[PDB]
Amino acid sequence: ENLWVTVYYGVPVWKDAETTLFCASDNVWATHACVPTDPNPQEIHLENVTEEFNMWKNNMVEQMHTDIISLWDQSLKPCVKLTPLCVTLQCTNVTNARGELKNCSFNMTTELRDKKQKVYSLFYRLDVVQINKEYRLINCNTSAITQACPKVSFEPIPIHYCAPAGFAILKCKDKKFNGTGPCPSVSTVQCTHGIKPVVSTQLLLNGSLAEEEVMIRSENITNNAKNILVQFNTPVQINCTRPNNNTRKSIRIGPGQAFYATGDIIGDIRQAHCNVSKATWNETLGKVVKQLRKHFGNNTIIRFANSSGGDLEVTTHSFNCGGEFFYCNTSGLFNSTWISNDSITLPCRIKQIINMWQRIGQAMYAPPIQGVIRCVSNITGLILTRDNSTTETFRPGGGDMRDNWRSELYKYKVVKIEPLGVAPTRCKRRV
Amino acid sequence: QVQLVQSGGQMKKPGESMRISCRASGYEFIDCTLNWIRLAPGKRPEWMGWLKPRGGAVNYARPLQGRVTMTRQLSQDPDDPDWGTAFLELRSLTVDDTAVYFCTRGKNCDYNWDFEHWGRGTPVIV
Amino acid sequence: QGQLVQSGATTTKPGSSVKISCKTSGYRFNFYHINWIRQTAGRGPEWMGWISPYSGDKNLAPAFQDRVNMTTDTEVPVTSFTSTGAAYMEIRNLTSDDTGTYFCAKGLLRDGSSTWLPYLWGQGTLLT
Amino acid sequence: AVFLGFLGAAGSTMGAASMTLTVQARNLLSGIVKLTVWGIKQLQARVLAVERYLRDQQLLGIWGCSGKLICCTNVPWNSSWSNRNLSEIWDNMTWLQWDKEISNYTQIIYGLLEESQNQQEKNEQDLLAL
Amino acid sequence: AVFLGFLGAAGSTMGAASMTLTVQARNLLSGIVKLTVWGIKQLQARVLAVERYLRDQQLLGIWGCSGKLICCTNVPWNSSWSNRNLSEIWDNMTWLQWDKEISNYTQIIYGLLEESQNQQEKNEQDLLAL
Amino acid sequence: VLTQSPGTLSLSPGETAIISCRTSQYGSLAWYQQRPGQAPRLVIYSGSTRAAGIPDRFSGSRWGPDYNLTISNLESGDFGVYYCQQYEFFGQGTKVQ
Ligand SMILES: *[C@@H]1O[C@H](CO)[C@@H](O[C@@H]2O[C@H](CO)[C@@H](O[C@@H]3O[C@H](CO[C@H]4O[C@H](CO)[C@@H](O)[C@H](O[C@H]5O[C@H](CO)[C@@H](O)[C@H](O)[C@@H]5O)[C@@H]4O)[C@@H](O)[C@H](O[C@H]4O[C@H](CO)[C@@H](O)[C@H](O)[C@@H]4O)[C@@H]3O)[C@H](O)[C@H]2NC(C)=O)[C@H](O)[C@H]1NC(C)=O
Ligand SMILES: *[C@@H]1O[C@H](CO)[C@@H](O[C@@H]2O[C@H](CO)[C@@H](O[C@@H]3O[C@H](CO[C@H]4O[C@H](CO)[C@@H](O)[C@H](O)[C@@H]4O)[C@@H](O)[C@H](O[C@H]4O[C@H](CO)[C@@H](O)[C@H](O)[C@@H]4O)[C@@H]3O)[C@H](O)[C@H]2NC(C)=O)[C@H](O)[C@H]1NC(C)=O
Ligand SMILES: *[C@@H]1O[C@H](CO)[C@@H](O[C@@H]2O[C@H](CO)[C@@H](O[C@@H]3O[C@H](CO[C@H]4O[C@H](CO)[C@@H](O)[C@H](O)[C@@H]4O)[C@@H](O)[C@H](O)[C@@H]3O)[C@H](O)[C@H]2NC(C)=O)[C@H](O)[C@H]1NC(C)=O
Ligand SMILES: *[C@@H]1O[C@H](CO)[C@@H](O[C@@H]2O[C@H](CO)[C@@H](O)[C@H](O)[C@H]2NC(C)=O)[C@H](O)[C@H]1NC(C)=O
Ligand SMILES: *[C@@H]1O[C@H](CO)[C@@H](O[C@@H]2O[C@H](CO)[C@@H](O)[C@H](O)[C@H]2NC(C)=O)[C@H](O)[C@H]1NC(C)=O
Ligand SMILES: *[C@@H]1O[C@H](CO)[C@@H](O[C@@H]2O[C@H](CO)[C@@H](O)[C@H](O)[C@H]2NC(C)=O)[C@H](O)[C@H]1NC(C)=O
Ligand SMILES: *[C@@H]1O[C@H](CO)[C@@H](O[C@@H]2O[C@H](CO)[C@@H](O)[C@H](O)[C@H]2NC(C)=O)[C@H](O)[C@H]1NC(C)=O
Ligand SMILES: *[C@@H]1O[C@H](CO)[C@@H](O[C@@H]2O[C@H](CO)[C@@H](O)[C@H](O)[C@H]2NC(C)=O)[C@H](O)[C@H]1NC(C)=O
Ligand SMILES: *[C@@H]1O[C@H](CO)[C@@H](O[C@@H]2O[C@H](CO)[C@@H](O)[C@H](O)[C@H]2NC(C)=O)[C@H](O)[C@H]1NC(C)=O
Ligand SMILES: *[C@@H]1O[C@H](CO)[C@@H](O[C@@H]2O[C@H](CO)[C@@H](O)[C@H](O)[C@H]2NC(C)=O)[C@H](O)[C@H]1NC(C)=O
Ligand SMILES: *[C@@H]1O[C@H](CO)[C@@H](O)[C@H](O)[C@H]1NC(C)=O
Ligand SMILES: *[C@@H]1O[C@H](CO)[C@@H](O)[C@H](O)[C@H]1NC(C)=O
Ligand SMILES: *[C@@H]1O[C@H](CO)[C@@H](O)[C@H](O)[C@H]1NC(C)=O
Ligand SMILES: *[C@@H]1O[C@H](CO)[C@@H](O)[C@H](O)[C@H]1NC(C)=O
Ligand SMILES: *[C@@H]1O[C@H](CO)[C@@H](O)[C@H](O)[C@H]1NC(C)=O
Ligand SMILES: *[C@@H]1O[C@H](CO)[C@@H](O)[C@H](O)[C@H]1NC(C)=O
Ligand SMILES: *[C@@H]1O[C@H](CO)[C@@H](O)[C@H](O)[C@H]1NC(C)=O
């Protein structure tokens, strides 16, 4: 009939988009520089709304994974470069009886450019390689090395991702929501929750649990080359420690250049390891094999094994504990074939010369942590990898790092608001 | 310009082992997954396993577990930094392992099983 | 703009109860009422009652309040505006007078003065 | 009324969502509360906020709708855009469903609103020339 | 009409160029589509775009012309500004020729339009005080 | 889980070679051509999408668990062994000659 167009401004309509999200806080991650998080976190429920999500096409995980890499390189700029340490090392074994951590001495530069000094230090064997006894730092024939500033914090801080004005973040309050599909119960938030950027491997640490039951993800579970993300609903307690009482020695290697070395080990020499409750891990491995039958069959066998090969950062549980990077042999956790007081101890190693991420260009020297190291964490997730009939084996994997933040950013999605709507109604303007 | 270059053929005996290479060039090595396919006359093309250069994460096929091993060795010199070398090792060789071994890569790094690029082949006679 | 397929033509005898289904598609099942209408051999058409898949609210005629068992599930959402729901139908004191063809019906609008009016009909189910 | 909040009626009818416009009119620009990572990235987001906002105010200005939340115009509703009834729109489909059906013709309508305004102040220019 | 385009009537009469204002009203702000050379230089240009635009909207707002493409006011045309006839302007010289002749008095006119608006809402303030 | 038939196809340059391949699971099946001595060549992927450099004579169709590959006009170079592929599994081959 007499229908003319009428412009509406401020209508609830959005589109899929990817913008530059900013961080909010309440260390390396420079969380002091983010906007102070609002004490009132407004969450508005979008009743009658269904939205299509996909944690694998999600861009917040691609942006954050670069926002952590760009945070790592940003924090090591003013820190001391350990380039003169790439010198011929004279190493022995530290007195004991396995000869792991070495005792190396070397002619080192001083504050005066014409004076040398014969100083010594301890290096784990993972940081050195022989020549033909003579050694050298592992990174010398590859890249330069920057020592981490001993005043920045390696501690994961709850980081909040927020969308700019005119954009919005879409939550998903579905408590059985697998990664993809349409979330039936959707709400909107100005900022995400407290994301702890815990760099982990194989076993996701300190993550957010799942309500109701434990779900597993993976974009296509039948594609064996897709990392399966399992998310526990109850937390399995894991305790880790480096029992050796270490010492840190400051070595002046120039005008203001002070390399911090491992002096000696006070007291006993022991072995760094981790503990989990075998009962809690047995029931949790039961919870994972429960949901695994809904995708593979109620009669097929499910086998667990350790890694099949690759780098050190993937074949072992690698993480941070008090400020030092463990590499925990997880073969004692994945050794159970399922069909139908306790304490499991993992032998962990320690590295100081790491590259992190997987970039070829720069390695970081972590100065040794003084005192005895022990940290208590929860493992909340798991990154598995299946291997030709009706019996599926599963092994841990940790190829890509951005699968970590993806296990926390699956509940979110960025959309842009376009508040311009044109719709007809029997309305016209005068003359 | 994706191009995969392998090593020469080898004649082995039962009980020994093999080591073949696969130097790729023309694409980011750590972004795309590589595979190993053997082709014996009168048999099905057998998939040995894939390897992701990002950390070296590998997945072996069941009939080869314990005998197959795949590694990598990407160069660390930023001038020609777009190349890696996927190595394949098969121990305790039998006469059934006589075939031509290929290394393959998907048409794109999103889907791995669309082998558009193939190596020239490394024939092995046990 | 979607289908509302029902069950078959199950014929029983008086005194018993009969279950009738109504599987929806092509539309948001929780956005529109589900009416139930029948045309028996003895009268014309008679409005039985509707139910809200969103509010879970019922309103049925006094001639069928003490006989009709009417329930709905919860939709399995396919897309943002598509879903797949189900509406169930059962009677109590059955006679040969209730012999007729039964169908479900999706509501007309989502608001206004004709929110529940039976717009999109099913296919029909022959009773006893 | 019920304070549903920001985008509270995204799944509701276009007639119910049209009565709560000043809710999404506030939070489209939010507000107020130097070289690092988020520092440069925050300023890049603060500029983009006012650009997308001024585009919607510039478009509203050249249509004669500057200051309106609901604005009536002269362009008649072409049946080729959407040959749907008035009751099957405002009391049925949502604003999200509406934008998908009009996504094609939405550029033609934006041009019809511009000249409909220029050929209105030009007519009023002659209306006050005496 | 003929879609001459952006600044298509820069050499045409002021009467012909005055009927195509929404063409240069769109591209004055364009739109939407991080540390390098052009990166910092692009953001510096994106900020300058909205500043010069808001100045022309702020000036239009304090004149009572907020939302107008052609705006009539109260300030009478002083013969000292341009003692030219109405036909020798709108059907002769272009908007470029016009700005050179008014470049002097253009600042006095901008002040006369401001108080002519404040002494209009103040009069209307008393007009609605009863 | 892949059953490829036939095993051999005797044809002349000018006929049409149609080779099927039944699969138990559903996925992105593909096809390969291996001329004598040379390496296999990707022909069709994701069911029906044609590869790069492949003539339009090659075409693939799908109906349920059955995937078919047909060559519209055989030449002296199209004679070889063809394989179907889903995930990591392949067919036994079909040598056309
Ligand atoms: C999400 O989406 C759903 C589905 O679209 C929306 O639910 C629908 O909302 C519309 C409008 O809000 C409803 O239309 C109205 O229907 C009522 C009929 O209800 C009356 O009778 C009921 C049965 O007898 C009775 O339950 C009601 O009593 C109250 O108690 C129930 C308890 O469950 C409570 O839940 C109810 O909300 C009631 O408050 C009630 O007495 C009808 O009366 C309405 O007509 C009036 O209003 C219209 C204008 O809206 C006016 O034009 C009329 O003249 C009259 O004044 C109106 O038709 C519809 O029934 C709902 N259900 C559907 C479509 O299945 C929901 O609102 C959406 N929510 C959000 C947040 O987006
Ligand atoms: C890694 O390797 C470094 C070597 O590069 C070790 O450092 C050396 O450790 C040894 C002990 O293991 C140190 O030797 C001790 O030195 C003491 C200092 O005395 C010196 O100075 C006085 C002058 O005041 C001289 O008179 C004296 O002769 C020394 O030259 C000595 O007091 C110690 O004597 C002990 O041994 C003798 C002989 O067995 C006994 O009779 C004594 O009673 C006494 O018990 C001893 O000689 C050496 O100085 C260290 N070198 C440096 C440069 O510090 C690290 O310990 C090693 N770290 C690890 C973890 O293995
Ligand atoms: C997973 O989360 C855990 C808790 O959120 C992490 O545990 C934290 O680990 C850090 C470092 O490993 C600890 O910081 C240490 O603090 C102690 C001193 O703390 C004690 O004294 C203070 C008083 O000031 C008291 O408040 C504390 O409760 C302690 O009694 C020192 O030894 C060091 O300075 C060191 O920085 C945290 O204390 C610890 N938190 C808890 C609750 O235990 C764990 O590291 C996380 N895992 C990973 C992999 O990130
Ligand atoms: C530290 O101790 C280990 C273990 O005893 C030594 O390893 C030996 O190295 C020699 C090389 O000359 C080999 O011939 C032996 O077979 C190794 N032993 C074992 C058990 O593996 C290592 O050489 C010691 N390092 C130093 C610097 O003394
Ligand atoms: C830098 O030197 C190290 C020495 O350990 C090289 O790494 C070894 O290289 C040999 C053969 O080149 C391999 O057999 C070993 O497995 C390698 N070990 C490790 C831990 O990688 C490394 O290749 C050298 N890098 C460059 C760029 O020359
Ligand atoms: C590890 O274990 C649990 C995970 O649920 C956490 O302890 C509980 O945390 C919740 C949430 O703050 C509290 O409501 C409970 O009272 C806590 N339980 C106890 C016994 O204190 C704990 O914070 C987790 N640690 C992490 C995630 O770092
Ligand atoms: C680890 O070793 C350090 C020293 O190497 C110990 O620190 C000493 O602590 C006592 C307090 O009981 C102080 O009186 C000493 O002065 C400290 N020594 C130094 C050099 O600072 C520390 O107690 C040891 N801790 C453990 C768990 O073995
Ligand atoms: C990991 O360490 C924590 C802390 O030492 C252990 O929690 C203690 O458990 C004992 C035995 O039940 C209690 O008596 C203590 O009160 C607990 N400590 C605290 C602070 O609550 C935990 O049992 C350890 N778990 C494993 C697997 O080693
Ligand atoms: C992780 O621990 C397992 C055992 O818990 C180690 O397995 C050993 O593997 C070697 C061959 O690689 C065998 O000869 C040993 O007999 C195995 N030991 C046991 C106890 O079974 C494994 O080597 C460890 N990982 C690393 C990197 O050392
Ligand atoms: C793995 O990916 C394939 C391809 O996307 C999925 O196959 C589709 O599955 C849906 C759901 O049954 C069907 O409607 C499509 O017809 C299938 N397409 C193809 C090409 O097979 C498969 O579902 C995925 N794996 C799982 C476990 O869902
Ligand atoms: C330091 O240099 C001197 C030069 O004579 C050499 O004898 C000595 O071995 C060097 N020190 C080390 C630890 O190599
Ligand atoms: C998630 O659920 C949807 C429908 O509920 C299903 O289509 C999809 O395959 C599921 N995701 C996975 C990884 O199976
Ligand atoms: C995995 O377990 C096997 C068998 O115990 C062992 O030979 C191998 O060394 C282990 N690998 C790792 C990385 O733990
Ligand atoms: C409707 O739009 C078409 C172009 O899409 C145009 O040709 C036609 O004249 C228009 N009709 C009305 C009544 O606006
Ligand atoms: C908009 O154009 C596309 C062109 O591919 C067409 O498919 C679609 O149907 C059009 N929209 C409507 C509402 O017809
Ligand atoms: C014209 O402007 C002059 C100042 O340039 C002023 O003195 C005079 O009063 C003005 N006359 C009129 C009629 O506006
Ligand atoms: C504006 O002022 C300058 C002052 O040098 C003068 O030369 C010029 O003639 C003036 N403009 C007009 C239109 O008179």
Beta bridge partner(s), residue A348: A328
Task: Tell me the residue range of the domain where E57 lies.
Answer: 1-130
Residue F80 and residue F8: Cα distance in Å, rounded? 10
E67 touches chain D (CB under 8 A): yes
Phi, psi of E82 (to 5 degrees): -160, 105
Residue A248 and residue E119: Cα distance in Å, rounded? 78
Phi, psi of D36 (to 5 degrees): -75, -150
Q: Which among C30, C54, C80 is the nearest to A182, CB-wise? A: C80
Helices (H), A259-356: 278-296, 312-315
F52, F35 Cβ separation under 8 angstroms: no
Alpha carbon distance, N-terminus to C-terminus of chain F: 26
CB atoms within 10 A of CB D37: 20
B86, B70 Cβ separation under 8 angstroms: yes
Q: Resolution for this model in angstroms, one decimal place? A: 2.8
Residue F72 Cα, gap to closest chain B Cα (Å): 22
In chain B, what residues touch A314 (CB-CB under 8 Å)?
Answer: 55-57
CB atoms within 10 A of CB E40: 12
Query: Looking at residue A211, what DSSP letter applies?
Result: S
CA-based nearest residue to A137, from A90, A85, A81, A100: A85
Residue F14 Cα, gap to closest chain A Cα (Å): 39
Chains that touch E (3 or more CB pairs under 8 A): D
Domains and CATH numbers, chain B: 1-126 (2.60.40.10)
Structure token digits, residue E75: 């300030």
Q: Which among C80, C81, C111 is the nearest to D15, CB-wise? A: C111
Breaks (C-N over 2.5 A) in chain E follow: 33
Q: Which residues contact B75 (CB under 8 A, 6 or more apart)?
A: B81, B83, B84
In chain A, what residues touch F28 (CB-CB under 8 Å)?
Answer: none
Distances A182 to A53, A174, D98 between C-alpha atoms, Å: 6, 10, 19
The domain ranges of chain C are: 1-128
Obtained via which technique? X-ray
Q: Which among D37, D73, D110 is the nearest to A6, CB-wise? A: D73
Long-range own/partner contacts, residues A66-72 (CB < 8 A, 24 or more apart): A67/A23, A67/D37, A68/A29, A68/A197, A68/A405, A69/A357, A69/A359, A70/D37, A71/A28, A71/A29, A71/A30, A71/D37, A72/A28, A72/A356, A72/A357
> Residue E112: enclosing H or E segment and its boundaries?
helix E106-127
Beta bridge partner(s), residue C4: C24
CB contact under 8 A, C109 and D16: no
Q: What is the distance, to the nearest Å, from the Cα of residue B78 to the centroid of all Cα atoms in its chain?
A: 24
Residue A330 and residue A383: Cα distance in Å, rounded? 12
D68 touches chain E (CB under 8 A): no
CA-based nearest residue to A330, from A415, A236, A428: A236
CB contact under 8 A, D115 and E32: no
Sign of CA dihedral A215, A385, B107, F70: negative
Query: Looking at residue D124, what DSSP letter applies?
Result: H
Ligand nearest to the CA of A92: 4
Structure token digits, residue E78: 């002083």
Domain total of chain E:
1
Residues in chain F: 97
- Nearest 5°: the CA angle A395, A400, A404 is 90
The amino acid sitting at A275 is N
Q: Which residues contact E29 (CB under 8 A, 6 or more apart)?
A: D51, D54, D55, D58, E49, E50, E53
Residue C108 Cα, gap to closest chain D Cα (Å): 9
Long-range own/partner contacts, residues F38-44 (CB < 8 A, 24 or more apart): F39/B102, F39/B118, F39/B119, F39/B120, F39/B121, F40/B39, F40/B45, F40/B102, F40/B115, F40/B118, F40/F83, F41/B118, F42/B107, F42/B114, F42/B115, F42/B116, F43/F69, F43/F82, F44/F69
CB contact under 8 A, F91 and B44: yes
A164, A176 Cβ separation under 8 angstroms: no
D10, D23 Cβ separation under 8 angstroms: no
Determine if residue D85 is left, alpha or beta; phi over 0 gives left, psi from -120 to 50 gives alpha, anything else beta: beta
A359 touches chain B (CB under 8 A): no
Residue D107 and residue D60: Cα distance in Å, rounded? 14
Cβ-count burial of A88 within 10 angstroms (0-12 exposed, 13-18 middle, 19+ buried)?
exposed
Residue F85 Cα, gap to closest chain A Cα (Å): 14
Residue D46 and residue D52: Cα distance in Å, rounded? 11
A164, A18 Cβ separation under 8 angstroms: no
Pick the CATH number of C1-128 from 3.20.20.70, 2.60.40.10, 3.30.70.600, 1.10.3720.10: 2.60.40.10
Ligand 3 — pocket residues by CB below 6 A?
A: A 156, 198, 205-206, 319-320, 322, 375-377
Structure token digits, residue E47: 């900020």
CB contact under 8 A, F42 and B119: no
How many beta-carbon contacts under 8 Å exist across C and D? 17
The finding on whether E104 has its CB within 6 A of some atom of ligand 17 is yes
A173, A412 Cβ separation under 8 angstroms: no
CA-based nearest residue to B104, from F51, F40, F35: F40
Residue C38 and residue C32: Cα distance in Å, rounded? 19
A107, A59 Cβ separation under 8 angstroms: no
Give the chain D residue whose CA is nearest to the CA of A67. D37
CA-based nearest residue to D54, from E53, A181, A265: E53
Residue A10 and residue A417: Cα distance in Å, rounded? 9
CB contact under 8 A, A184 and C77: yes
Q: Which residue out of B59, B64, B89, B109 would a mutagenesis test of the A interface target, given it has the greatest number of A Cβ atoms within 10 Å?
A: B59
